[PDB]
Amino acid sequence: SVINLLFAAYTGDVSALRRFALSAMDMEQRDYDSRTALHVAAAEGHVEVVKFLLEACKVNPFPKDRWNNTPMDEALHFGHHDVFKILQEY
Amino acid sequence: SVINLLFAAYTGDVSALRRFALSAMDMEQRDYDSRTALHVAAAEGHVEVVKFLLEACKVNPFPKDRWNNTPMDEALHFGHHDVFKILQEY
Ligand code: NA
Numbered sequence: 546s547v548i549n550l551l552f553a554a555y556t557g558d559v560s561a562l563r564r565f566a567l568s569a570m571d572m573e574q575r576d577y578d579s580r581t582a583l584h585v586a587a588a589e590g591h592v593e594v595v596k597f598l599l600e601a602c603k604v605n606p607f608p609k610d611r612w613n614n615t616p617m618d619e620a621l622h623f624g625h626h627d628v629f630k631i632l633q634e635y
Numbered sequence: 636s637v638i639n640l641l642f643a644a645y646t647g648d649v650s651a652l653r654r655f656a657l658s659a660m661d662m663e664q665r666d667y668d669s670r671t672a673l674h675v676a677a678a679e680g681h682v683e684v685v686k687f688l689l690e691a692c693k694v695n696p697f698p699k700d701r702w703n704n705t706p707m708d709e710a711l712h713f714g715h716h717d718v719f720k721i722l723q724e725y
């Protein structure tokens with residue numbers, strides 16, 4: 546569910562993301578702005594969420610939102626340098 | 636539901652927005668990116684949706700999303716001169 550997934554990313558709720566992924570939720574679904582859970586996590590600087598999505602869920606690391614920004618662009622824009630460097634590995 | 640609201644604005648579904656507003660839904664509700672129905676409608680150039688939100692629902696014409704953009708900024712970004720003109724009179 547878009548509401549549940551992207552809000553869980555927004556609040557850093559790794560436990561909820563895990564329940565969703567285990568239940569086979571598509572962790573790459575997008576909202577009306579073409580945003581992903583990874584975009585939102587990276588914009589908030591949620592390191593553990595970003596690592597979970599990338600490593601355990603294998604999500605696309607470079608989705609493009611409606612402004613053509615990637616999660617890495619968002620991390621740099623909002624000052625989350627640790628998240629930025631995590632995404633750099635990809 | 637903020638996501639139902641914003642998806643209706645995304646697809647230009649004025650009939651759905653009317654049903655929501657009539658049932659006392661808060662039409663100024665924000666998502667995890669601080670986006671409003673008015674932002675999304677303006678980005679998509681949905682003139683009738685924009686005028687319905689402004690004129691019938693009396694929403695704030697200048698909400699600011701996560702990137703500090705207003706619906707007017709989105710109208711401009713996506714080239715919607717017609718939507719820009721509507722917002723300019725506010
Ligand atoms: Na952090």
Ligand code: NA
Pocket residue numbers: 622624
């Ligand atoms: Na800065």
Ligand code: NA
Pocket residue numbers: none
């Ligand atoms: Na916030």
